[PDB]
Design a protein around this nucleic acid. Sequence first.
RNA 1: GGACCUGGCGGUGCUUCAUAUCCCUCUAGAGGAGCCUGUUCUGUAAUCGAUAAACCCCGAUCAACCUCACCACCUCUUGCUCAGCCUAUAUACCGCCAUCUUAACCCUGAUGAAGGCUACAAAGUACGUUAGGUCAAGGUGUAGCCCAUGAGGUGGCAAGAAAUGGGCUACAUUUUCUACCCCAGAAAAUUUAGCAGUAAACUGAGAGGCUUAGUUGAACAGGGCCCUGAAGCGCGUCGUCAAGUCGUAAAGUGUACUGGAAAGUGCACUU
Lengths: 164, 126, 398
Amino acid sequence: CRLPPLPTIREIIKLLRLQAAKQLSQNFLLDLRLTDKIVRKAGNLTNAYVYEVGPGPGGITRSILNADVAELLVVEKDTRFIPGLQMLSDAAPGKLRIVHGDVLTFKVEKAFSESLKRPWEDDPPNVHIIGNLPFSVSTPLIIKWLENISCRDGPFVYGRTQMT
Amino acid sequence: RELPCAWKPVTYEEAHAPHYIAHRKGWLSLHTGNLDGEDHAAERTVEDVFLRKFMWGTFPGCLADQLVLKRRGNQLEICAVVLRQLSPHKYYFLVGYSETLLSYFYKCPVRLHLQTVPSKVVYKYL
Amino acid sequence: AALVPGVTQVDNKSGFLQKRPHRQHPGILKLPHVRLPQALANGAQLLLLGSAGPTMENQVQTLTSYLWSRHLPVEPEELQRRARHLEKKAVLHALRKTTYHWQELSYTEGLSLVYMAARLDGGFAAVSRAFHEIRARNPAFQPQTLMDFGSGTGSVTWAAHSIWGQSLREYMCVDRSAAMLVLAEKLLKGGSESGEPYIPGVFFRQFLPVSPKVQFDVVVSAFSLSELPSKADRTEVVQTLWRKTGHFLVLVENGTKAGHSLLMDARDLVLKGKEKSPLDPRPGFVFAPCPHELPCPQLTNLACSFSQAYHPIPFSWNKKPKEEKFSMVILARGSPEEAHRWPRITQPVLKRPRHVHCHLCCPDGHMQHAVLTARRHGRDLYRCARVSSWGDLLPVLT
RNA sequence: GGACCUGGCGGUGCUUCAUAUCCCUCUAGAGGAGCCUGUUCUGUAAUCGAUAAACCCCGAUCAACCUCACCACCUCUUGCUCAGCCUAUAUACCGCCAUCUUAACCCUGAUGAAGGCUACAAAGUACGUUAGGUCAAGGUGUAGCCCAUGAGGUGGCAAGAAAUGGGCUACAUUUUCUACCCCAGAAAAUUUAGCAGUAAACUGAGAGGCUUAGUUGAACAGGGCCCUGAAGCGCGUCGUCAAGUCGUAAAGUGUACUGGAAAGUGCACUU
Ligand SMILES: C[S@@+](CC[C@H](N)C(=O)[O-])C[C@H]1O[C@@H](n2cnc3c(N)ncnc32)[C@H](O)[C@@H]1O
Ligand code: SF4
Ligand SMILES: [Mg+2]
Ligand SMILES: [Mg+2]
Ligand SMILES: [Mg+2]
Ligand SMILES: [Mg+2]
Ligand SMILES: [Mg+2]
Ligand SMILES: [Mg+2]
């Protein structure tokens, strides 16, 4: 599976129109090797449905697609990265489903089919969440999702979905 | 050696470059052929070539420097500069031999003017 | 000796002789005069608008002559061998006289502009002829991926676009010179620092990727290996490129003894596989211009080059059409398609009354100087030779 | 473990000016018409290809029923003369052009690595290279075919179309013709130079498109750079999974809390 090369920081500065390197207000993991490590630690993703948050440049996206996922739902807030993610989707047809919106309000409960819903007491329902978000957004997100587990709703309508 | 590691006595005639021929050096051969109106320049050139080859093969390792070939009327003077390594008897033999061969080969009174030197007169080192 | 009088006959497959004239015989690979895309020429002139005076003509001429007459770097063993003889017969001065002083060219901004102005059109023509070889002989090939080692101004990228733009989707351009990368980007963007690229999917890198996992459909190196400072660097680069080559490896150099020697070294290196257990086990053969894999019969004292006529970019000094003389070798993965491989005409064909001179590199590994005439060889083969030209294939069998 | 030293970045940017070539400005001319050439497409079995080899007998010239070249059919044979071809090769040499390369001494630091300047002066002095072009004002060889790469005969071949590149002619009223050599009468967009006796216009002499001698004689003449020159300041002194057959170019120190933590806030300190 041949995919486009990862964008270097030069192309990223050009893409965000900053024209310099000290004005990003953001840190990117542009090391496909550490992202390989993270996706390995997420478990066995073969034919899994991955809800990936905070896609960004797409190191995590490339790592996950390298694993034989079935559907990879991407939720990006910025529109300057949608072009790169569309190129990624075209390079790997049928696997990358990109969406625009906030992860704090996006409704994952309708995203995937209802044939994946396992019971709560059974094994985790083959649906995974992977996320490299800004730390200013991951804490409210985990509080919200902890409430969802307490109520057995939201991303956990499919069962005991695992998060990384 | 090594690639960036890279980055002989000579007499007067050898030292000075061709663009000094009328500035510092002279002309070895002197004749009227190349003057304006005169003829047979090519014949004189061919004669000069033969003289130089013959002399360099008849005095091997003796000529310290290049010949000077002068021509006045039908006379043909070879002024050569030789070393003091060969015996004078052999020099006299070769002078007589060369004079007679060149006189009968060019149908003119050729004459030869050895000047011996102790060793090559080195001008500089290049 | 692939032309025995009265024995060798034209190779009639697909019913060639019956359905189509001789001027279109399948070995005709000659390309019409090459014109650069208008976008490329306009970008070049726009980028050179800053300074295109009488100095630039002299600079272009000097750079062109320097590159054409440049030799391969002198290996240290060669210095030792020559120094031994010079001592046997001061020695350093004699070496300085009798050895070529090979220098690295540092392509800063000014030299990048001069190199563009001096070589863009020539490189485009040479690479276009090399690519037309593949296109003509394998029209089914639809590459999706191209890499260009030493992509100076993007001439390979533009030629590959002009030929396979309906399928190519990624152009990796490797060039350690930041000024040259900047110039290539400006050229792709219409000669303006800000704009929209004409070719989509071009990626620029300053370091050569070294990984056999990532493998390209076409890997090109045009006038790039002559800039490497040593045979060890050339060997490692060629090994890396062959490892990353998926279908075709196109090497192009100047049509000189130095370029031909460099290319034949690369050809031997690729053909004599040394890797014990490579990731890609497919063997390699010579798709063009060689009809064999045996040693070149012209590496002894001559060279082997091919000419492509082209129209230079209009400038204050470019008025008449020019000719680009280049050496090439295309190495393809797999095995030869069939056993009917045809002689290559490696020199201008001389047409004279009722006979034709062709210098052929035969499949058996030998050169043959053939004087083809109708009565001796056959009317059809004589007409095929009459219409053929330099760098074409002669369809002869048995 | 402590102290110190050399450094090296084949480095990175900027600053000011000398900044001439090169710019930019500025000045003066160079697109239409008719033919001839370059490229492309289309078309033919084929060449709208050439005249030490036609024609013409103003210049030039197109196809000429010249002749060579191409295409389709044939013929000749020991013949021209131990025949005949300009067919190749300078990718044979020579020649002619062109390309590229071409140490010692003396002091200082306690006699350590190490260092050595002040002018109203404080240790410093001494040829090769090339698958190059040229077989027309030139040679020395080598190869080819010899029922044909030789000699003839019968027909055909004589292209079409565009866009652009180039060349030759005439292109006027500040002109043209006569007399005169200047007071008469009749007619009707890129590019090339600039920089002065230059551009432009007009005459003569030569060797037989090239070399020399003259006459008349302009317009513009301001700003800034690339690049060496002259110096100055600063900066700067990469990462990762198993090493590359890896990727790439006001500020601080503590402590406490931190659930909108790519670090923030609170309290106390330092320069
Ligand atoms: C001058 S370009 C040759 C012309 C160019 N290929 C074209 O198509 O016109 C060759 C470039 O290769 C670069 N180069 C040399 N070694 C390299 C390497 N090992 N990796 C990447 N680039 C290299 C040099 O900097 C040089 O600029
Ligand atoms: S085509 Fe023949 S002469 Fe040319 S490089 Fe190949 S083997 Fe050598
Ligand atoms: Mg001829
Ligand atoms: Mg004709
Ligand atoms: Mg003839
Ligand atoms: Mg030659
Ligand atoms: Mg807080
Ligand atoms: Mg604090």
